Amino acid sequence: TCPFYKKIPGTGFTVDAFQYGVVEGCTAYFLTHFHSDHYAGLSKHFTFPVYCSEITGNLLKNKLHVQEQYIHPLPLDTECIVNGVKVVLLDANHCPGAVMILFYLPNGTVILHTGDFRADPSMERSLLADQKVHMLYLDTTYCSPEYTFPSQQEVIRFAINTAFEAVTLNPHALVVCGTYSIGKEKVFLAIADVLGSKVGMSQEKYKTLQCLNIPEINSLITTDMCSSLVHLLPMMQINFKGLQSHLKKCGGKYNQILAFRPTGWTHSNKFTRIADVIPQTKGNISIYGIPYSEHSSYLEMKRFVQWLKPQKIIPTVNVGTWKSRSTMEKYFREWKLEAGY
Numbered sequence: 001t002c003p004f005y006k007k008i009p010g011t012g013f014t015v016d017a018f019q020y021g022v023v024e025g026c027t028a029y030f031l032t033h034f035h036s037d038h039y040a041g042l043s044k045h046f047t048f049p050v051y052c053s054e055i056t057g058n059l060l061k062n063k064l065h066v067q068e069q070y071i072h073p074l075p076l077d078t079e080c081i082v083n084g085v086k087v088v089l090l091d092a093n094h095c096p097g098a099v100m101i102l103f104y105l106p107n108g109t110v111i112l113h114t115g116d117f118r119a120d121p122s123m124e125r126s127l128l129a130d131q132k133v134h135m136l137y138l139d140t141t142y143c144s145p146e147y148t149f150p151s152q153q154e155v156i157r158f159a160i161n162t163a164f165e166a167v168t169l170n171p172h173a174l175v176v177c178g179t180y181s182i183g184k185e186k187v188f189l190a191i192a193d194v195l196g197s198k199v200g201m202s203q204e205k206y207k208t209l210q211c212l213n214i215p216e217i218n219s220l221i222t223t224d225m226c227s228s229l230v231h232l233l234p235m236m237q238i239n240f241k242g243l244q245s246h247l248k249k250c251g252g253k254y255n256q257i258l259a260f261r262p263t264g265w266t267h268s269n270k271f272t273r274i275a276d277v278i279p280q281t282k283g284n285i286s287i288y289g290i291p292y293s294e295h296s297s298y299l300e301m302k303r304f305v306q307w308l309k310p311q312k313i314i315p316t317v318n319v320g321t322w323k324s325r326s327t328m329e330k331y332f333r334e335w336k337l338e339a340g341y
């Protein structure tokens with residue numbers, strides 16, 4: 001059934017709860033962002049109100065074919081009333097259209113649901129600065145101190161420099177970026193921009209990017225593969241076998257592939273700083289795993305929570321084992337004692 005951390009107490013609201021059938025007493029279903037583990041269950045047959053960002057709403061309409069009458073997009077940073085409850089959507093710094101939701105409950109309690117987020121100091125200057133938060137539903141994906149990775153900007157700097165050098169040294173090299181969902185678009189957009197090329201992709205991926213309100217997107221992306229020297233492929237094809245096969249389809253136009261696998265955190269990232277990252281190479285194909293994260297590092301998560309000073313924290317990730325739940329509560333306790341709330 002629907003887990004407790006997906007229900008907002010004192011309301012008829014659920015968050016990211018689309019795979020449990022009709023949730024008893026739910027009058028509005030919130031969707032934090034368009035990632036399959038969150039929209040799972042939504043389809044053209046859904047007949048309840050869905051509240052979300054404009055971008056998420058574009059994807060619901062065009063990709064899942066949810067009926068327009070059930071899509072309720074809300075602007076960011078704006079007090080809105082939904083079923084008699086004041087709510088605000090805030091940028092989650094996750095993927096395009098991803099939001100955190102602030103609920104102002106009728107009894108005076110204030111709840112922040114982060115959805116998925118990458119905590120950032122800029123969030124300390126949103127509407128969050130203005131009032132106390134009694135409950136925090138926290139994206140705890142990387143809630144352990146071993147989860148370190150660089151900033152997104154540092155990872156992009158590495159990717160741009162690596163691609164620019166390779167193509168400047170060999171104008172016949174092809175750059176390939178793997179993708180499986182929305183998010184992490186900056187990897188391929190920044191590489192294509194430095195190389196003066198558009199990004200070539202399948203019709204399905206092109207359709208998805210057309211829903212993202214990305215400025216000047218028609219100048220950046222294309223389905224014309226051969227006119228482009230940065231190609232997007234499904235993540236599962238970013239291996240030597242899949243890349244060798246892709247190189248044949250190009251028709252003697254390229255003699256080298258440099259490929260990027262933007263992963264999340266990897267244990268290798270503790271040893272090797274972003275500047276020391278080296279690829280796996282087989283012949284004329286090199287594959288760079290790069291730690292581009294759209295979730296908070298441990299340090300980013302700790303800073304955000306210690307600033308927010310919530311009275312109670314409900315984790316939404318890694319909640320499956322006694323060990324994982326215990327470890328997270330121990331960190332919350334440490335953060336609270338250190339900061340004094």
Ligand SMILES: C=CCNC(=O)c1nc(N[C@@H](C)C(=O)NO)c2ccccc2n1
Pocket residue numbers: 035036037038116141181183264
């Ligand atoms: C290792 C931690 C990172 N996060 C997940 O474990 C995760 N991420 C997903 N997609 C990403 C894009 C996302 O951010 N979604 O919200 C999944 C999609 C389908 C099934 C399981 C999924 N697990």
Ligand SMILES: [Zn+2]
Pocket residue numbers: 033035094095116
């Ligand atoms: Zn996500």
Ligand SMILES: [Zn+2]
Pocket residue numbers: 035037038116
């Ligand atoms: Zn997720």
